[PDB]
Amino acid sequence: SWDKDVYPEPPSRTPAPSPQTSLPNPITYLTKAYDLVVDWPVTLVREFIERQHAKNRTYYYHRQYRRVPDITECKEGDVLCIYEAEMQWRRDFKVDQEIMNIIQERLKACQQREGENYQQNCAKELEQFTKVTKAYQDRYLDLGAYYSARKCLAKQKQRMLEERKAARQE
Amino acid sequence: DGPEKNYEKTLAILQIESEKAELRLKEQEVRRLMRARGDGPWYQFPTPEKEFIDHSPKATPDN
């Protein structure tokens, strides 16, 4: 299973078979024999396993990371507070890599299924990619290899100033 | 162990390394002032021992 909201998937619409030839579809036969000889024995092996995994049911949790003071709340030089603001940002920055991948999975998953209509029926997924990319580029692009929170902050302040100077004229 | 230990040790290390860094910069500022002004316990340079001045009455009065 998986969450169908994280990974949206249009319902399948298979036309019902319309066989108007006298001959037998050889696909539909090896599909029966495949179910009896391959699918059926395997499902027993899996049902056996999941009855063991039910007897030894174990649990694990997603770790919670409360929020710590931002970098903006750190006096210059106080490495004790910079360190925690830096660790948090690195955690945040990493979750943003995986958000981008998820948005990319959708766009790739849509391109395949729409097939010859991707130029039309993949607009919404291409729009989220185009939007979530602009945000990503506005946060993390050009930081460099030694990227950190302080550089992320410096890049934002330099951009908030270049836009304030847009209206200071207009 | 959990992440706590490595995290809070790294906090403990960073504090030690940070306090040391400020002491080292403070010693240079201190040594610069004591040496140039001679008003501190360091860089005291010798002056003649006054205990060997002869305080007795002399053969002459004007002394």
Report the chain A residue with the minimal C-alpha distance to residue B11. Answer: A80
Sort out which chain A residues have CB atoms less than 8 A from B7's CB and list them.
87
Helices A79-114, B3-37: crossing angle, 10 deg rounding: 140
Locate A125 and state its tokens.
């997924």
Q: What is the resolution of this structure in A?
A: 2.8
Locate B56 and state its tokens.
């007795």
DSSP-derived letter for residue B61 is S
Q: How far is CA A9 from CA A14, A35, A108, in A?
A: 15, 26, 12
The experimental method behind these coordinates is cryo-EM
Q: Which amino acid is at A81?
A: C
Counted across chains A and B, CB pairs separated by less than 8 A come out at: 12
CA count, 13 A, side-chain hemisphere, B50:
1
Pick from A123, A71, A131, A77: nearest CA to A99 = A131
- Contact between residue A69 and residue A84 where contact means Cβ atoms under 8 Å apart: yes
Pick from A68, A67, A122, A135: nearest CA to A96 = A135
